[PDB]
Design a protein around this nucleic acid. Structure first.
Lengths: 261, 102
RNA sequence: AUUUGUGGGUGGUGGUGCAU
């Protein structure tokens, strides 16, 4: 149970953050990041009622002042709740500019994005519009190559999903450093998506979307030299099994004319 | 009269917005004055106390160890490339002619 | 220990008729 003065100060700070969209931040918001009980301070302040510019300023202050794990947890919770609330409030599922700036700050925070925010949204199963917005944000702002390849290998090791496929497509469009293990993870994702003629699978025999087809085309265009001869033959077998009409021909041409590692 | 009423309505709305902003500023000032120190003392007296991360760390280590990039651009049409080259050559020729004249 | 000297991408968080 928080104290009465604590509850009153947190409610006043939350109301001030909800009623403010511009200007200067209060000394309460300036001294809240210098304490250790930031999670309890935010739970007492109820940041689910603030504005988008206030949320962007709070995310910027957290990324500038706070530490790795606390910033990751706070960014995960606050950004996931605010993004879900904004996508639910928008009938056309559109994002705000201050929300995009807060997402850019949370992506500039390297540990807070992949471990905290991006993995939890994919675990909560964001929709196709949220996956497209995340892919647009990841194509606009680019994080470090280590975190980019880590998110790519994590989405490849994870199962098939719309958000995971959109993240893999955005990673293939960004074209970060694809190591031997990253190419092996991508080839394992491709082998789990390809059909196995003794134990079949739903992801092995399921239909893939146009975003996954474009992701495979970009991967064959970019990381052909990261795949070996057997991996290129497996990619050609996957393009023969679950290929396409127009995007599949350039994919097979890249898989047949690309170099080997 | 309609334009004057429009001006008056705009001024009234601006005054209302200014009053709201002043109220919000006063509230924020009172907050920073008292509730700041209150919440600071309260937070000082209070207390508020992996597979994905492992895979990410492994992938990051792998990417730091080895890297193989070959981001080749999309090959344009041969006719389009020839047209672009011809345009560049024509631009060069026109520039040379312009230099020779003026 | 993120940023510096050099190359480098650059129009659609587009309006849009109408048929489905």
């Amino acid at each position: 149970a928080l104290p009465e003065k604590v509850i009153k100060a947190y409610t006043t700070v939350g109301s001030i953050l909800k009623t403010w969209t511009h200007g200067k931040l209060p000394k309460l918001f300036k001294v809240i990041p210098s304490l250790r009980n930031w999670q309890d301070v935010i739970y007492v302040t109820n940041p689910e009622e603030w504005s988008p510019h206030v949320v962007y300023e709070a995310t910027k202050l957290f990324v500038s002042n706070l530490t790795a794990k606390e910033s990751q947890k706070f960014i995960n919770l606050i950004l996931l709740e605010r993004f879900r609330d904004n996508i639910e409030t928008s009938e056309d599922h559109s994002l705000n500019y201050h929300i995009y700036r807060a997402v850019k700050k949370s992506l500039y925070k390297p540990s807070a994005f992949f471990k905290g925010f991006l993995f939890p949204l994919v675990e909560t199963g964001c929709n196709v519009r949220e996956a497209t917005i995340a892919g647009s944000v990841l194509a606009k702002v680019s994080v470090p190559a280590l975190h980019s390849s880590a998110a790519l290998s994590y989405l490849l090791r994870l199962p098939f999903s719309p958000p995971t496929t959109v993240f893999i497509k955005i990673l293939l469009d960004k074209k970060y450093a694809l190591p031997y293990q990253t190419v092996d993870d991508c080839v394992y994702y491709f082998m789990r998506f390809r059909i196995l003629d003794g134990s079949n699978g739903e992801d092995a025999t399921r239909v893939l979307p146009v975003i996954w087809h474009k992701a495979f085309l970009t991967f064959a265009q970019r990381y052909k030299n990261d795949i070996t001869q057997d991996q290129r033959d497996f990619l050609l077998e996957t393009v023969r099994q679950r290929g396409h009409k127009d995007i599949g021909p350039e994919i097979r041409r890249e898989l047949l004319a690309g170099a080997s590692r | 009269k309609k334009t004057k009423a429009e001006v008056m309505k705009e001024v009234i709305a601006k005054s209302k917005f200014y009053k709201q902003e002043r109220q919000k500023a006063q509230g924020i000032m009172e907050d920073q004055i008292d509730n700041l120190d209150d919440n600071f003392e309260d937070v000082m007296s209070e207390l508020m106390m992996t597979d994905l991360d492992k895979e990410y760390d492994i992938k990051v280590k792998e990417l730091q160890l080895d890297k193989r990039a070959a981001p080749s651009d999309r090959t344009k049409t041969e006719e389009e490339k020839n047209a672009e080259a011809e345009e560049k050559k024509r631009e060069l020729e026109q520039q040379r002619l312009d230099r020779m004249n003026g």
